Structure 1
Amino acid sequence: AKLEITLKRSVIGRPEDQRVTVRTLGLKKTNQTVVHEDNAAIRGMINKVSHLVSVKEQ
């Protein structure tokens, strides 16, 4: 069940852990988009950084 994750806010001014999580998710520029397969690990990652991310289930 692929789902799309979009970076909606810049990372400038954020603590290091949130930046590392966002970078590990694959996002590198604002307004980027990427697809991943839905499981508990991805949901936890989204939960950590959710104010900088918009999730949509295609």
Structure 2
Amino acid sequence: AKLEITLKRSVIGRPEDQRVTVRTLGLKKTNQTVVHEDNAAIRGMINKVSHLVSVKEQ
């Protein structure tokens, strides 16, 4: 169980708390993708910035 998480929207103009969450997923650049283990921790991060990211389930 793994998630491809892609940053679709810029973090420019977004609250710091959302920016931090995005960066903590390892997303440093628009359209970057990162892979993480599907769990409640990551799902919650995604929930907090769902408007900024896109999620494929591997």
Q: Could you list the runs of 5+ residues in structure 1 that have no partner in the other structure?
A: none
CA distance in 2, matches of 1:22, 1:34: 11
Percent identical pairs in the alignment equals 100
1:28 positional shift: 0.3
SS in 1 for 2:10: coil
Structure 1 length as normaliser, TM-score? 0.96
Quote how far apart the aligned CAs of 1:3 are. Answer: 1.2
Deviation beyond 3 Å, 4+ runs, structure 1: none
Q: Deviations over 1:3-49 (max 9, x none)?
A: 10000000110111000000011000000001000110111100000
Distance in 2, matches of 1:44 and 1:18, equals 12
Q: TM-score, normalised by structure 2?
A: 0.96
Alignment length, in residue pairs? Answer: 58
* CA apart distance, 1:2: 1.2
Q: Which runs of 5+ in 2 are unaligned?
A: none
Partner SS for 2:50: coil
2:5 is paired with a residue whose SS is strand
Q: CA RMSD in A?
A: 0.5
Q: Whole-Å Cα distance in 2 between the matches of residues 11 and 51 of structure 1?
A: 11
